[PDB]
Structures are given as structure tokens and as C-alpha cells.
Design a protein around this ligand. Structure first.
Ligand SMILES: C[C@H]1CCN(c2ncnc3[nH]ccc23)[C@@H]1CO
Length: 167
């Protein structure tokens, strides 16, 4: 039993809700919130910009030190950093950005990072400003993640469309 509320159960382990991931994380304080990161951890917009703003830019400060030490992530890769005031840990995961021409096949690799964590609050990877089809992202999530994932969907029409079209 955990403290996530109002989620529709899609499968044994995947749950979905129309919610603002920042407000969700602040309420639940999950062990892990997933960020829709880029390889440079430049949290400008989308989910990443929103989460970073909620940390008063502390996420960006921590991220800049991470990059200065380690260099960029790989597309499809991840790193674990602090969750600041939002969660214990933030798993920064780089899904392919279609608007940069990146290979959508790397989306499965991106979701595989979730399997290293028993429970996560997450967005749909490569959705929103990353330019992929959210229906496809949900399908890959369901077919890749085996741990318990609570998906927070910003767009209401999308949430309803994702639910009504879910196979
Ligand atoms: C619509 C896309 C882009 C934004 N994003 C979000 N999802 C959940 N909570 C959020 N809070 C702020 C942004 C955001 C979706 C990720 O596929």
C-alpha cells in the first residue's frame, strides 16, 4: 500500500491520472519522481522546467555540478540526483526528442531505467515538447516497465484519449 490517490489502474503495475506532476510530487513526496531530462540537464521547459522552478532552481544548480563532473547523459540514459523538496530522489531520464531528430526506438531504453526503482511518479517519456506520440509512449511504458509506475498526464484531452484508446 502506498499514498497515491485517484489513479486509474491500467495494468498490474501501471497507473494513470490527469495531474500536474509538480503538485503531485509535493503532495505525495514519493521516493522517486522522474524528470523528462535532456542530456545536458538543462531544465528549461516542459516537465523539467516545471520541476526545477518548484525547487527554486536548486535542481539546476545540482545538475550543473553533475554535468561539470560527468559530462552529458546518453539519449536513453538516466542519473539519480536529489528530489529536493519534491521527492527523495529525482531520476532524470532522457527520452528521445523527436524535434531534434532522435531515434524513437530509444524510448524503450529510456523506460528501462524505471525498472531500477520499485515505485515511481513519472511523466510519459518523450511526450509534450519532446514531440513523440503520447499513445505510443504509454504503450512502450506498459510493455517495458515492470516496477510500479504512477503516470501523471498534464493534458486533459490527452488523458481522456489515452484512457479511451488504451488496449
Ligand atoms: C504535455 C507534456 C509536456 C509537459 N508534460 C507534463 N506532464 C505532467 N506534469 C507536468 N507538469 C508540467 C509539465 C508536465 C507532458 C509530458 O509528456
Amino acid at each position: 500500500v502506498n499514498s497515491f490517490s485517484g489513479y486509474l489502474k491500467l495494468t498490474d503495475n501501471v497507473y494513470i491520472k490527469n495531474a500536474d506532476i509538480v503538485e503531485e510530487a509535493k503532495k505525495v513526496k514519493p521516493t522517486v519522481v522522474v524528470n523528462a531530462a535532456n542530456v545536458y540537464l538543462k531544465h528549461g521547459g516542459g516537465v523539467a522546467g516545471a520541476l526545477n522552478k518548484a525547487t527554486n532552481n536548486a535542481m539546476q544548480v545540482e545538475s550543473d555540478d553533475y554535468i561539470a563532473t560527468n559530462g552529458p547523459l546518453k539519449v536513453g540514459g538516466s542519473c539519480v540526483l536529489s528530489g529536493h523538496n519534491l521527492a527523495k530522489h529525482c531520476l532524470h531520464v532522457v527520452g528521445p526528442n523527436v524535434n531534434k531528430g532522435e531515434d524513437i526506438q530509444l524510448l524503450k531504453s529510456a523506460y528501462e531505467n524505471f525498472n531500477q526503482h520499485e515505485v515511481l511518479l513519472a511523466p510519459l517519456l518523450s511526450a509534450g515538447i519532446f514531440g513523440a506520440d503520447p499513445i505510443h509512449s504509454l504503450r512502450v511504458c506498459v510493455d517495458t516497465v515492470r516496477t510500479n509506475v504512477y503516470l501523471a498526464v498534464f493534458d486533459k484531452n490527452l488523458y481522456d484519449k489515452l484512457v479511451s484508446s488504451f488496449l
